[PDB]
Design a protein around this ligand. Structure first.
Ligand SMILES: O=C(O)CCc1ccccc1
Ligand SMILES: O=C(O)CCc1ccccc1
Ligand SMILES: O=C(O)CCc1ccccc1
Ligand code: FES
Ligand code: FES
Ligand code: FES
Ligand SMILES: [Fe+2]
Ligand SMILES: [Fe+2]
Ligand SMILES: [Fe+2]
Lengths: 172, 443, 443, 443, 172, 172
């Protein structure tokens, strides 16, 4: 498809993504919120199994949302934790984000770049709780004239047809 | 083998004084007895008639721990079968939904029609020289399947009463949601599935008789959500009269409000749609039910729904200490596409694995189940004394046993029904015991 | 918690009408009774004499769920011991294979010789002033160990019959593989180990009496595999006569073919080697067995092998719903290195965790075991009526009870042997019941 | 079902001949009976008074499998409560340690004071029109809590004897560590927690009566450590006399040494501190205990400590085949900060998940537990005949039953106490049986 | 030891490996087959435990193959899935490949480069099935004059002595 | 706020870390010991849960060491394995180190660079044993005049409050 970016752009965008993940891991949600762009779209859907004939045709059983947010709803999700009355977040969860297989390419809109990565999110909470979420992820990133990067979109894929955790109180 | 005599069901629960022993939430023998009797003899939710519109359409679901397939027949009827090949017990379907003409076992190749008969057997003359009776080896069929205004229920036992008699008064509350407009209802956009590590009795009891927790558990969500101008305070703050119905293990609860208003969690467009179509709903049902756009309702054992956000929830037990939740979104058929999209967004935002409200509830249930692992922990009495002795029958036209919304009538009724079903051989004995209990409690 | 008396073994299986209740595949009390009796009293495969050629060589294996070590002695005999230190019960060996002069417990330091006696005890005079009898505290030894033409079997119980009498007629079929050429056989290149989530009865029954599934389960493999000129069509298409032997739980099955031909899954070099050495094999055994290069064979409880690809398979039960498979490749000793490499490549390609054929079988077994979790699922009868009433004894010189290859004689015999062993105290009662059953079925 | 009649405890263990059947390490009914009786009636370690200095300070710990919270009261007393809300059984605390004024249930909002009473109930007049008795619904309280020289123990049963009488002679050995200097002791720097897959009886018995294994299991650590040049040979080589105390399930063991010397694993600064402070310790206690800076001790069921490295270990059972270890480091209060840092470094280096010594012990226990899965493996007798018949009472002023350090007196005493507690209804019967056993063994 | 390639070659070869993994994850087996070279060798063996003396000497218990393929056998494995009668892969499995620790070195043969990486393969199938395969991997890659890369060899190491999955229907 | 290193330094330091991990995976402990610098500090601590008020203040329950080593103690740990009498590591375990999210920054001391990464350590031993350790890691690296790198410090973070393995016989 579109031509791959050069070495410098790949390096800078990879460092930006690593910095955002590190902000999420250290419980700094205001800086992470400062990272996002005003038109952020944060999306995740469900996974289904289909018949052989349907797969050959391309038809699938209907699906539904799990996350569908803009910046304001993310602000509300942050404030809910900041109040001190979220019993899912008391005590807070300990998470690690691992990112790999970074592919970056250009886009039709100037100063916007498309990114695809694979992720493993490890979540441990309270005593003797462990959960792994493995999947892929698509992003779009915008560069400003002052050499600063913003995140415009994020679409997440989870490989579990039946999710095996009681809740998802962590931002992917 | 498994005999109820060794167990002491009536010893564990004391309804009259309002005490519960936690051992009922963690006992494996109790779980096997439940699987044999409660899920064997009670009507269970299967699907919605909107999901199988045309002949040959099927849907895969569960009853207890048994996989079941629901298929629409050519003449217009509906049939449910067990997923098991009569030869070596291998499943014949795996897709979530679709259309088919026959089910084929992949292990050996036996083929069954949609009506369940065994049509094809590979190399039959060589394999069966004496002859095989294809009539005897059809698919296992659920004897009783019946639909109430578009919701399909099924029962394993023929001796059990019919769907209308099993429902009884709770039909009057379900009709409030199901009969708002002409054309009935339909499901919108897929099913959400996830797993929680708690006994199946916790969510059932909460959706039967728990409005007390919303004051403290969901304080943060109310504070944050409390955009377009709307009533910041929830409905319960300004409410005047409240009603709870607690009969036959079926529980329901709501508040009286002057105006038709949904809760603060819903989107503005949904509330506007509710307000605009008030005349038709009032004309079809009546003022009391038309003004109800909030509350909770449960149908024994495992059907739950809330009036405001339009969500259906089904709990499938997986062992004594796990459960699996399937969540559907349901809305009026006459609504346009934009309103249905608004409904889907609102329901998926408020309720789900990542909803604002579900997280705390699941956390509490899992913590309780984790605690119930010690000898001393599961031998200490728990209090169920809310609203004890104030039960009465209303005279304003609302059927059933009624009490204040901050009471545990429905929880005690559910536990009494559980103890009666678990400890009786025949349905008639259960009905006699239930009648005796009602006559006792009412006087 | 487990009682033999409350169990009703004869109730679960009905051999005469051909019905099976799936509860036998999932019951824990049945599993413990099996561990006590069936694996306690039956001959079990241990190793091959090629794996322990020189004195002091050992091999680690299993019997039931008990770890066992097989060691070659100084004078040429073979012994088997339980892996347990007599003081505190810690294992004394962990390597897969090797050569040693003594086994040392790492926890405290007790040392045992290869003959099993306790040779060393650290600080004995200070620790044991009264004195210790080293004769009493030797390694636990398997009382009965015996080798048939290079395959080593072992038995825990002295009262059980000898290896030759336990085998009986199935020895005539095993001799077809083991005695093709002068010099015996040997193993080539390591052992493959993996885990499947299914009861141990599924693969045993399939390798005893199942050729029916290969028509449908392995259709894709036949279609794909079917440049050197060879018969694309499988052997079963053009076979004239077929035989199945179903006696004492020992099962076997094959087709009659004009020419010595292996199946389509083997490599060309292997088939060429089989064709070139036909005269010696025919002279040593006879025309009937020499022309058999395809079939299935199973020895009760858990030894399986196929004639074409030269594979040995052993199943170790791990709980009521798991099993562990060990796979060996075996070939004639006189074969050159190139032919042995061809054998190894062919066997590892066709059968294994990544083989073309094993994947579908393991998938089917795991799906059935997953389904068997509901109360209604494991209370429905299953059909075993193939070839019922056509059993007869051949007069052409082939020993044993014989029926058509598309029949379930061997499966019913295996289930009858299972029910007899599980429900009898002495071997003599088992033998009497087996004789009565054979006299009944033959007439 | 768990009942004394169906089980045969006395059959499994034979103290007089010194035999043990491994089935006691893997039986679930035995585990439930243990949870009911042994942990229900025996004093269990809770905390140290240094961890809760000021009023309102709390600490979260376990008794058996039940979570418990220990809180310091305003008047100076100490109280322990069960972590369970009287309404719906939800926990009220989760932090490891801290200071608080009330415990609030997050599910509904009931609030409890530090003394355990129920102070707040949200919307009580509306929810409970008839009235609620707040006196009855207080927190479950441990009836017996008592501290010995700064170590807090608790008991669930009132009929059991007091702490001093329960300890008895082992108090004389614990006083050696606890009363070395004025001011008592205090804990230094946090708690280490980890999980091992073995029965609790393995570490309990080893820390009761096992010095034999240190010769072989820890050979590599001795060879490597010799941190710099020191006395290369461990204490056991130079030691002249050795003592083991094996009474009432309480075990202890040490060596006699001319000079006050710690083991080779400790740092030089710790040994220098011991040598410098030997005078005060000798003056306070006596020469015999003052010169003891090595050995092992155990208090029934699950308290362990070693004299040299100053470590406290508590084992919490988690099922029949798991255990969780909490490790504390304890030292004299008068020691300066540098010496305490040296103590922490030494203890964490030698003992812990990553210590030089703990790794091999945990490995051995896990291997034994893995082996104990076969029918034949857990039905073979194990030897307990070390030092049999040489028991005698010393006349040099050391209390209790005494034998050589390379003997299993304490292990047999622990198993006898286990069999007596598991098979008796009242404490008086247990005491009578223990007295009879002691009178027998002395003859 | 082995000379390390410069930045540009490292970047290009890493991108090639990521592209191949992405092709495998999206169920595009014909393009993945187009990626391989004619002399591809696809190998995996078993794992054993040996005595201390054997390890000191270097001897091991004998091992055996698990995979041993050329391009034609891989074509057969693809066609078997394409028929529609493979019940192991009906419904298909959902996989993710995560690649890390990429080391690239030159080789004696011109235009051939040696690669070593570590991999985690996550496989989820049907409902509530999850499996992780972690290990190392050795590759050889050939560059054409038109700046296109082909895979010449692949040798895979799995750290499980007793494999804990019922079958391996996924291409590593 | 310290400036990120350029492309060349990032490449070289990443390759050095990969080489060290590969040395650990192949059971070459003498070369790995040769890698470390004389003033190596090898550290790990415990993890605790605190009250909401404590987290707002910044206080937490007290913690304790798990590893605290210099080069000599690491030499002793190596020699203990080399003796042949360590029953924890007989037979040896099989481990894989996966490193990701590498961030490199400059330091005040000349020729010293600070590194932060995320790690997953997979350990499989005997038959049917598997363990994952996921966390973060901080390092300092010193460059010699001959373009050789040494490791000066290492501080490891483990996300488990109650460690779920019976022992830790592997060097992180
Ligand atoms: O009326 C509503 O929409 C929700 C009220 C509620 C509160 C607690 C449990 C179920 C429903
Ligand atoms: O004869 C052969 O080579 C194997 C044929 C076969 C097919 C299915 C089960 C057992 C044996
Ligand atoms: O004296 C010591 O410090 C340790 C001796 C020891 C040996 C074996 C078990 C516990 C304690
Ligand atoms: S398994 Fe269904 S036909 Fe045999
Ligand atoms: S554990 Fe074997 S000698 Fe003690
Ligand atoms: S759960 Fe504690 S007050 Fe209800
Ligand atoms: Fe709620
Ligand atoms: Fe087969
Ligand atoms: Fe020790």
């Amino acid at each position: 498809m579109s031509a791959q970016v050069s070495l410098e752009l790949h390096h800078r965008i990879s460092q930006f993504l690593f910095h955002e993940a590190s902000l999420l891991d250290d419980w700094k949600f205001r800086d992470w919120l400062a990272q996002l762009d005003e038109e952020i779209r944060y999306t995740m859907r469900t996974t289904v199994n289909a018949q052989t004939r349907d797969r050959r045709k391309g038809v699938q059983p209907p699906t539904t949302w799990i996350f569908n947010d803009t910046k304001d709803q993310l602000e509300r999700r942050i404030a809910r934790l900041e109040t001190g009355m979220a019993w899912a977040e008391e005590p807070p969860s300990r998470t690690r984000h691992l990112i790999s297989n970074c592919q970056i390419s250009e886009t039709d809109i100037p100063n916007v770049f498309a990114v695809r990565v694979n992720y493993l999110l490890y979540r441990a909470q309270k005593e003797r709780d462990e959960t792994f979420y493995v999947g892929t992820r698509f992003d779009k990133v915008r560069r400003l004239e002052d050499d600063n990067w913003r995140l415009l979109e994020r679409d997440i894929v989870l490989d579990q047809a039946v999710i095996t955790s009681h809740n998802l109180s962590v931002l992917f | 083998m498994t005999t109820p005599s060794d167990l002491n069901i009536y010893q564990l629960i004391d309804t009259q004084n309002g005490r519960v022993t936690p051992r009922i939430y963690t006992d494996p023998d109790i779980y096997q007895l439940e699987l044999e009797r409660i899920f064997g003899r009670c009507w269970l939710f299967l699907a919605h008639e909107s999901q199988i519109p045309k002949p040959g359409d099927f849907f895969n679901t569960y009853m207890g721990e048994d996989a079941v397939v629901v298929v629409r027949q050519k003449d217009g009827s509906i049939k449910a079968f067990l997923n098991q090949c009569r030869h070596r017990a291998m499943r014949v379907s795996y897709a979530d939904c679709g259309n088919t003409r026959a089910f084929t076992c992949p292990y050996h190749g036996w083929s069954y029609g949609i009506n369940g008969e065994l049509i094809d057997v590979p190399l039959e003359p060589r394999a069966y020289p004496q002859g095989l009776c294809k009539s005897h080896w059809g698919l296992n069929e659920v004897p009783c399947v019946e639909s109430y205004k578009g919701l399909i229920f099924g029962n394993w036992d023929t001796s059990a009463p019919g769907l209308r008699d099993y429902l009884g008064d709770i039909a009057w509350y379900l009709d409030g949601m199901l009969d708002r407009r002409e054309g009935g209802t339909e499901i919108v956009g897929g099913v959400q599935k996830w797993v929680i590590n708690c006994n199946w009795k916790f969510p059932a009891e909460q959706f039967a008789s728990d409005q007390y927790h919303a004051l403290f558990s969901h304080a943060s969500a109310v504070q944050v959500l409390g955009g377009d101008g709307q009533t910041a305070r929830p409905v319960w703050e300004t409410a005047k009269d409240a009603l709870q119905f607690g009969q036959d293990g079926h529980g329901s609860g709501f508040f009286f409000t002057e105006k038709p208003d949904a809760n603060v969690w819903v989107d503005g467009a949904v509330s506007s749609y509710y307000r605009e179509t008030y005349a038709e709903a009032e004309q079809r049902l009546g003022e009391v039910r038309a003004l109800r756009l909030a509350g909770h309702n449960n149908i024994f054992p495992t059907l739950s729904w809330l009036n405001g956000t339009a969500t259906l929830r089904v709990w499938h037990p997986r062992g004594p200490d796990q459960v699996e939740v399937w969540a559907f979104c349901i809305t009026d058929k006459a609504a346009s596409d934009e309103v249905k999209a608004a409904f889907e967004n609102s329901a998926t935002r408020a309720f789900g694995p990542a909803g604002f409200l579900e997280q705390d509830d699941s956390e509490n249930w899992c913590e309780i189940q984790k605690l119930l692992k010690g000898h001393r922990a599961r031998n200490s009495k728990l209090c169920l004394e809310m609203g004890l002795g104030q039960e009465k029958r209303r005279d304003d036209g609302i059927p059933g046993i009624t009490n204040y919304i901050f009471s545990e009538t429905a929880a005690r009724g559910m536990y009494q029904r559980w103890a009666d079903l678990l400890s009786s051989e025949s349905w008639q004995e259960v009905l006699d015991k239930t009648a005796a209990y009602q006559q006792e409690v009412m006087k």
